[PDB]
């Protein structure tokens, strides 16, 4: 109840902190993934247009 610790010296420390900000922007073409450049499939994809 009558004891206290007081520092007598110090130090300077440099630390790292790594945080992500963005990811890779991606785009997807419906044709050339569902219908592989075929005319018969591209006439059926319009119903799912």
């Amino acid at each position: 109840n009558n004891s206290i610790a007081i520092p007598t010296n110090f130090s300077i420390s440099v630390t790292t902190e790594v945080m992500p900000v963005s990811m890779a922007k991606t785009s997807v073409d419906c044709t050339m993934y569902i219908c592989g450049d075929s005319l018969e499939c591209s006439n059926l994809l319009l119903q799912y247009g």
Binding site: S27, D29, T31, M32, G36, D37, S38, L39
Partner: protein, 97 residues
């Protein structure tokens, strides 16, 4: 009763059809022993076995095929090439892109 099988082997029994000329670096639809598709035919430097006919990609998409007359190697690429973006202003202002 007749039994058929279709493998990566040279064909023995074939239907009556007359071969045509070979066109390269163009968007055409081909027919190699009944395998009909659409792509750009290019000369290829890949090496096959002594019996195999068409190679395959990672997604089971045939991209190389051997013509049964020249017995050489051809490469198939899609007619559509890459992604194309269009930059436009508003249509009420102009129509130049």
């Amino acid at each position: 009763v007749l039994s058929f099988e279709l493998l990566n082997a040279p064909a023995t029994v074939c239907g009556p059809k007359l071969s045509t000329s070979l066109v390269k670096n163009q968007c055409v639809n081909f027919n190699f022993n009944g395998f009909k598709g659409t792509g750009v035919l290019t000369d290829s430097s890949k090496t096959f076995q002594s019996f195999q006919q068409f190679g395959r990609d990672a997604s089971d998409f045939t991209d190389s095929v051997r013509d049964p007359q020249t017995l050489r190697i051809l490469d198939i690429s899609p007619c559509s090439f890459g992604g194309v973006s269009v930059i436009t202003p508003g249509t009420n202002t102009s129509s130049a892109v």
